[PDB]
Design an enzyme around this catalytic site. Structure first.
Site, PDB file in Angstrom:
ATOM      1  N   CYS A  95       5.320  -2.246  -1.624  1.00  0.00           N
ATOM      2  CA  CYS A  95       4.787  -2.981  -2.645  1.00  0.00           C
ATOM      3  C   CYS A  95       3.970  -4.273  -2.093  1.00  0.00           C
ATOM      4  O   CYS A  95       4.845  -4.824  -1.306  1.00  0.00           O
ATOM      5  CB  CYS A  95       5.900  -3.102  -3.650  1.00  0.00           C
ATOM      6  SG  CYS A  95       6.427  -1.900  -4.616  1.00  0.00           S
ATOM      7  N   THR A  96       2.818  -4.544  -2.718  1.00  0.00           N
ATOM      8  CA  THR A  96       1.993  -5.929  -2.458  1.00  0.00           C
ATOM      9  C   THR A  96       1.576  -6.270  -3.499  1.00  0.00           C
ATOM     10  O   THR A  96       0.772  -5.757  -4.079  1.00  0.00           O
ATOM     11  CB  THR A  96       1.058  -5.745  -1.392  1.00  0.00           C
ATOM     12  OG1 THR A  96       1.774  -5.046  -0.228  1.00  0.00           O
ATOM     13  CG2 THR A  96       0.342  -6.704  -0.817  1.00  0.00           C
TER      14      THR A  96
ATOM     15  N   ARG B  40       1.703  -5.402   5.915  1.00  0.00           N
ATOM     16  CA  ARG B  40       0.764  -5.566   4.733  1.00  0.00           C
ATOM     17  C   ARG B  40       0.680  -6.900   4.246  1.00  0.00           C
ATOM     18  O   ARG B  40      -0.369  -7.248   3.786  1.00  0.00           O
ATOM     19  CB  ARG B  40       1.897  -4.915   3.764  1.00  0.00           C
ATOM     20  CG  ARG B  40       1.924  -3.419   3.976  1.00  0.00           C
ATOM     21  CD  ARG B  40       3.034  -2.663   2.960  1.00  0.00           C
ATOM     22  NE  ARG B  40       4.273  -3.140   3.019  1.00  0.00           N
ATOM     23  CZ  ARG B  40       5.169  -3.157   2.317  1.00  0.00           C
ATOM     24  NH1 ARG B  40       5.042  -1.932   1.311  1.00  0.00           N
ATOM     25  NH2 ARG B  40       6.470  -3.740   2.511  1.00  0.00           N
TER      26      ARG B  40
END
Ligand SMILES: *[C@@H]1O[C@H](CO[C@@H]2O[C@@H](C)[C@@H](O)[C@@H](O)[C@@H]2O)[C@@H](O[C@@H]2O[C@H](CO)[C@@H](O)[C@H](O)[C@H]2NC(C)=O)[C@H](O)[C@H]1NC(C)=O
EC number: 3.5.1.60
Lengths: 102, 234
Positions: B1-2, B174
């Protein structure tokens, strides 16, 4: 391929909660049994007996409105409600694989 | 998740979100966009999945948008019972949906997410419409919260958060890549298409990425935009 947008739905809050997700479930009924079976595998086995026991106590974690939605989802999908409650509470259990720790 | 929030020079606030899920390909088939309507009016929208009636990526059109990142720290063995306890004590996805339904403004939503009570450790990213209305809310073990808002006058025009903290956070490829890419594109003229370029950069996009989405709650047609801005990755 070229249009990879998620399908759009309107959830009418004026409808009774047990009927709101009928169309969503009906359109994805093909995939639901496999998703459930595959999601459960991410729950650590020592805690699975507890999750199923706690998940049956649906009235303790949700408002009546959310209870009826979850019951309606379980009825439309034909899947045991305790598993549906468990997946919704353990929202990230299948997001990050942590089975190597057990 | 970003999850990313950025405010450009013009004052527009953009909310970008990638969802990474280990059960990647099965989840893509049941990813849906939902408009929650009442008396013929959209109350709030969200992304979710068949069988899940909570919201972890959602928007109050015209007012604010929210996304939740799970927070993973060490000692998963030591704390598994406490993790399960707080998840049952206050179901996360339904708490988010309840905020989208009953909190009308960015400021109201941020305070609701900041209340001192048992809450599963996570990062709640909220985007607004006014100046510096972009915050990362850190839900800590197990009832406290910290806020980190935008500071455009201090040249802090974006916020980026993933799933970790401490060393693992600073080494997340990320998060590092997204920060580099935001700096390359620069604050000026940063728009939703700039957010698409960021969210599509490897490894922000990766093998586990289910979908990428962009939300601009300040738009006059934010609901129309959100309804077509999500991309389920091949
Ligand atoms: C999306 O779903 C497809 C559909 O496959 C099956 O559909 C149902 C009938 C049910 O049996 C599901 O459990 C199946 O997934 C997926 O394609 C399948 O992928 C698996 C992966 O191992 C493979 O075994 C099957 O042969 C595939 N079937 C076909 C026809 O190709 C697909 O993986 C899912 N994800 C995406 C992103 O499409």
């Amino acid at each position: 391929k070229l249009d990879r947008k998620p399908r759009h739905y309107e959830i009418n809050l004026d409808e009774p909660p047990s009927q709101r997700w009928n169309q969503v479930i009906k359109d994805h009924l093909e995939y639901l049994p496999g998703v459930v079976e595959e999601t459960k595998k991410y729950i650590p086995k020592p805690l699975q007996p507890f999750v199923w026991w706690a998940a049956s106590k649906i009235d303790r974690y949700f408002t009546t409105e959310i209870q009826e939605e979850l019951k309606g989802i379980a009825s439309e999908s034909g899947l045991p409600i305790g598993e549906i409650v468990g997946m919704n509470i353990l929202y990230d259990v299948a997001a990050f694989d942590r089975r190597h720790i057990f | 998740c970003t999850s990313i929030v950025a405010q450009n020079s013009a004052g527009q606030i953009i909310h970008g979100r990638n969802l990474d899920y280990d059960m990647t390909e099965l989840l893509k088939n049941i990813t849906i966009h939902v408009d929650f309507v009442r008396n013929g009016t959209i109350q709030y929208s969200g992304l979710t999945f068949a069988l899940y009636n909570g919201v972890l990526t959602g928007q109050r059109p015209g007012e604010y948008s929210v996304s939740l990142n799970a927070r993973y720290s060490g000692a998963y063995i030591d704390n598994i019972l406490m993790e399960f306890y707080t998840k049952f004590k206050r179901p996360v996805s339904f708490f988010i949906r309840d905020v989208l339904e009953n909190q009308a403004t960015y400021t109201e939503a941020v305070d609701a997410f900041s209340r001192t009570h048992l809450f599963s450790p996570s990062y709640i990213i909220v985007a607004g419409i006014k100046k510096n209305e972009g915050v990362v809310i850190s839900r800590n073990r197990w009832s406290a919260a910290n806020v980190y808002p935008l500071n455009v006058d201090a040249n802090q025009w974006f916020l980026v958060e993933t799933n970790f903290d401490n060393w693992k956070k600073q080494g997340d490829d990320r998060r590092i890549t997204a920060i580099q890419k935001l700096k390359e594109l620069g604050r000026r003229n940063f728009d939703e298409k700039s957010m698409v370029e960021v969210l599509s950069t490897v490894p922000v996009r990766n093998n586990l990425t289910v979908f990428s989405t962009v939300m601009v709650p300040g738009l006059p047609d934010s609901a129309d935009y959100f309804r077509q801005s999500t991309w389920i990755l091949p």
